[PDB]
Enzyme design. Sequence first.
Site, short mmCIF file in Angstrom:
data_model
loop_
_atom_site.label_atom_id
_atom_site.label_comp_id
_atom_site.label_asym_id
_atom_site.label_seq_id
_atom_site.Cartn_x
_atom_site.Cartn_y
_atom_site.Cartn_z
N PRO A 22 0.84 -1.21 0.00
CG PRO A 22 0.10 -1.00 2.21
CD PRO A 22 0.75 -1.98 1.26
CG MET A 23 3.67 2.30 -1.57
SD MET A 23 4.95 2.30 -2.83
CE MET A 23 4.10 1.40 -4.15
N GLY A 55 -3.40 3.89 1.37
CA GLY A 55 -4.32 4.11 2.47
C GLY A 55 -5.49 4.98 2.04
CD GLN A 97 -2.95 0.71 4.34
OE1 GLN A 97 -2.69 1.86 4.01
NE2 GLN A 97 -2.03 -0.13 4.83
CG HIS A 176 -2.35 1.81 7.82
ND1 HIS A 176 -1.40 1.49 8.76
CD2 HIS A 176 -1.75 2.67 6.95
CE1 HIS A 176 -0.28 2.15 8.49
NE2 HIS A 176 -0.47 2.87 7.40
N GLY A 177 -3.07 -0.79 10.76
CA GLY A 177 -2.86 -0.69 12.20
C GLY A 177 -1.42 -0.40 12.55
CG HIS A 179 3.64 2.32 9.24
ND1 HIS A 179 3.30 2.15 7.91
CD2 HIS A 179 4.41 1.26 9.58
CE1 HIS A 179 3.87 1.03 7.46
NE2 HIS A 179 4.53 0.47 8.46
CE1 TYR A 181 0.37 8.36 9.59
CE2 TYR A 181 1.01 6.16 8.90
CZ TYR A 181 1.16 7.53 8.83
OH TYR A 181 2.11 8.06 7.98
NE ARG A 274 14.62 -4.87 5.64
CZ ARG A 274 14.89 -6.13 5.31
NH1 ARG A 274 15.96 -6.75 5.82
NH2 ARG A 274 14.10 -6.78 4.48
N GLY A 301 11.97 -2.75 2.86
CA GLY A 301 13.34 -2.94 2.42
C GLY A 301 13.62 -4.24 1.70
N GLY A 322 7.31 -1.83 -2.09
CA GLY A 322 6.84 -0.46 -2.23
C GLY A 322 7.62 0.33 -3.26
#
Length: 364
Positions: A22-23, A55, A97, A176-177, A179, A181, A274, A301, A322
């Site tokens: 998802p981007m 998202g 998402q 989206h759970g 990062h 948010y 990472r 990554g 991504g």
Amino acid sequence: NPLFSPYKMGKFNLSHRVVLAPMTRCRALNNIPQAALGEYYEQRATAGGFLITEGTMISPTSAGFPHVPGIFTKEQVREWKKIVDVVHAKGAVIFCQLWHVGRASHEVYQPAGAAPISSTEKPISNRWRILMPDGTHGIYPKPRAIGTYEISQVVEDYRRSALNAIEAGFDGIEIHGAHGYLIDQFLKDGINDRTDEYGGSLANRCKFITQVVQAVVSAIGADRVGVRVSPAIDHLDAMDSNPLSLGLAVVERLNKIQLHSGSKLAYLHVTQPRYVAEEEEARLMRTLRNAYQGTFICSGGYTRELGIEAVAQGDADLVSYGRLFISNPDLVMRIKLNAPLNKYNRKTFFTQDPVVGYTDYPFL
Ligand SMILES: Cc1cc2nc3c(=O)[nH]c(=O)nc-3n(C[C@H](O)[C@H](O)[C@H](O)COP(=O)(O)O)c2cc1C
Ligand SMILES: CCOC(=O)/C(=N\O)C(=O)CC
């Protein structure tokens, strides 16, 4: 090449294990999906390949970036349907998402310039700055801490947006759970200082994600729901004192939801620590994978070699990419052929042009 062995993600028969991560790309002008999104996802779709969208807003207060799509209005549903149709015509599977940013927002992104919402009154610190619609960077404000009635309203926003996604033709949704948010603002003990039933213990901190996942599972079926988390992440001051215990507590709840529902979720999707915008990092990933009863997607990554190794060694069932998918519309084919990859241009990640830096990266 293990990335090209087929995989049964519940009812979905995938032909390979390379996933579009998802981007957020900010081409959905005025929060309405645009024709440009259709071209972008069509370029990246493959027969039997799995795609996850950028998202997508669940409500008018859920945004913290400019021109991100919503799926809370019938207008948005109608436009998503055209995008889903073109992706399905290529034989791909696509999930939407569902994204609420919580305190990672600004007055400019909120109705009537109101404060963003969160589990707490604590703002993201000034180490981080928010991208503004004009391309400058602003200050994250103090959020408003929501009560339990408003929490239940946000859960209902997820539930309605999941139903809207199905109405648009999506195969499923991803929660989206991750990062830092909204959901992560409840999960992480570095943020959640509440003294009610949604804070004060690890079990209480997991209550919000549990209710969100239960609500969308009840609405559309567990096999159409994926869940993304990042218990160890350096993003927006979202730290936990014990990331592995937090991750395992979430996994336990997902396993229990599956047993209660009688069906497995589509997947658990976890960000490698990472990744930002060791064997302790590999320790965490494999521990969560081994603990979860279902399909595991790793992200963060990954390269062709790292994705091959993850699947070959049993560390993941699917691998999401991504940045290289931004600049390589045919990334799946390039990975299959071991063909050289195109560079990506960070400067056009979040601009609004429907072509430049979006659909004009070349095929092989
Ligand atoms: C420009 C950009 C936008 C992103 N937007 C989202 C997003 O909306 N939701 C999300 O869960 N992750 C988002 N991510 C993280 C990606 O899903 C993915 O985990 C990450 O890009 C994988 O690492 P890689 O770029 O090395 O492949 C985004 C990443 C980038 C670079
Ligand atoms: C670094 C982890 O956070 C992310 O990847 C992310 N969203 O989830 C963004 O960058 C939004 C554009």
